[PDB]
Design a protein around this ligand. Sequence first.
Ligand SMILES: Nc1ncnc2c1ncn2[C@@H]1O[C@H](COP(=O)(O)OP(=O)(O)NP(=O)(O)O)[C@@H](O)[C@H]1O
Ligand SMILES: [Mg+2]
Ligand SMILES: [Mg+2]
Lengths: 20, 341
Amino acid sequence: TTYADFIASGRTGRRASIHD
Amino acid sequence: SEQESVKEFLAKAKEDFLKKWETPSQNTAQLDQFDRIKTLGTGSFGRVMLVKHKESGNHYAMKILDKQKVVKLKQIEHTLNEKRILQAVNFPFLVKLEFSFKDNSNLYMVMEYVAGGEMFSHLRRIGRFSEPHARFYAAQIVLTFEYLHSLDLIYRDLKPENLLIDQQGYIQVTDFGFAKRVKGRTWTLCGTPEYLAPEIILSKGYNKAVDWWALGVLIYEMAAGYPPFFADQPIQIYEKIVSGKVRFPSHFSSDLKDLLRNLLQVDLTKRFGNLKNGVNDIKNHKWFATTDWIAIYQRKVEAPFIPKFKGPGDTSNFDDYEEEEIRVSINEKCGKEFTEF
Ligand SMILES: Nc1ncnc2c1ncn2[C@@H]1O[C@H](COP(=O)(O)OP(=O)(O)NP(=O)(O)O)[C@@H](O)[C@H]1O
Ligand SMILES: [Mg+2]
Ligand SMILES: [Mg+2]
């Protein structure tokens, strides 16, 4: 499932902003 | 009455904003007036700390920015934007800047402490929000953007991490790091990868319409529990964003999918919030049919979720972070660069 794929990804924690 | 009531409010709001924009508040506190308690969140050039103001006894959230880290990452202008804009704005869903000041080493922005935690923490724990739940938050963001955009401001970092839940269950938008006052187009590649509009990525100039794209991403993430474009690395995310193909969960209502198709729209001549009728195309959409916009503004709508609050100073709704000594040099760093702060 899409959910399972998301949870298995490395981007489920707090996301830092990017620049610049 | 309907349109004339909003217009008159916004005209007075701009009057108030411009006065503070032209003559910003400066040096309204100092470090030794506060006792630092606990870190609420860490960032690239510093942290936000729970603090206690000595003379009042009130708790606040103190954003500390290391000047040398700001200069190194070429964020001087953005940081000056952040403070100048935040001190000048006034809206029910925007966090209040209570004090600001600087010392030899750091810049300080002291906000009202929003104890309910990030929407992010609640969203990940619960998994997803029901459509009425998501709609409640979305409505507050819609009004907030209507307000900010009328002042020629672009927000540029909409995400659950930057949205705090207050003691009444309402949104308090924080983090004006990429907020900018612009009447023309702008070019900076900034924001958070999952929330970036295609025009940002493709190094095209862009305008306030990127905030409406970000709203699409937020609504999707709130209702699905995951973003519409995700991957392990930002470059892979950007590829998905640019392609534009969006898939929806089976539980998404037909109304929600229609709104999101109009929000997550690559074509600027077709994206909701950027058309002839502006914000009204979003406000009058079938998905928002049950929304009483005035009642939301007046904060008279029952919140679907009220965070647990165990008195003043409680950080239960926030993650724990590693604490670090706040160092202040005997020599002034970057004095000229931050003169106006
Ligand atoms: N007024 C506030 N009350 C309570 N907590 C807050 C407040 N402001 C910020 N925080 C917390 O501190 C964190 C960092 O604040 P923020 O202004 O987002 O810093 P940042 O370094 O600009 N983050 P980002 O640019 O998104 O990577 C937030 O994610 C919140 O969890
Ligand atoms: Mg942030
Ligand atoms: Mg930021």
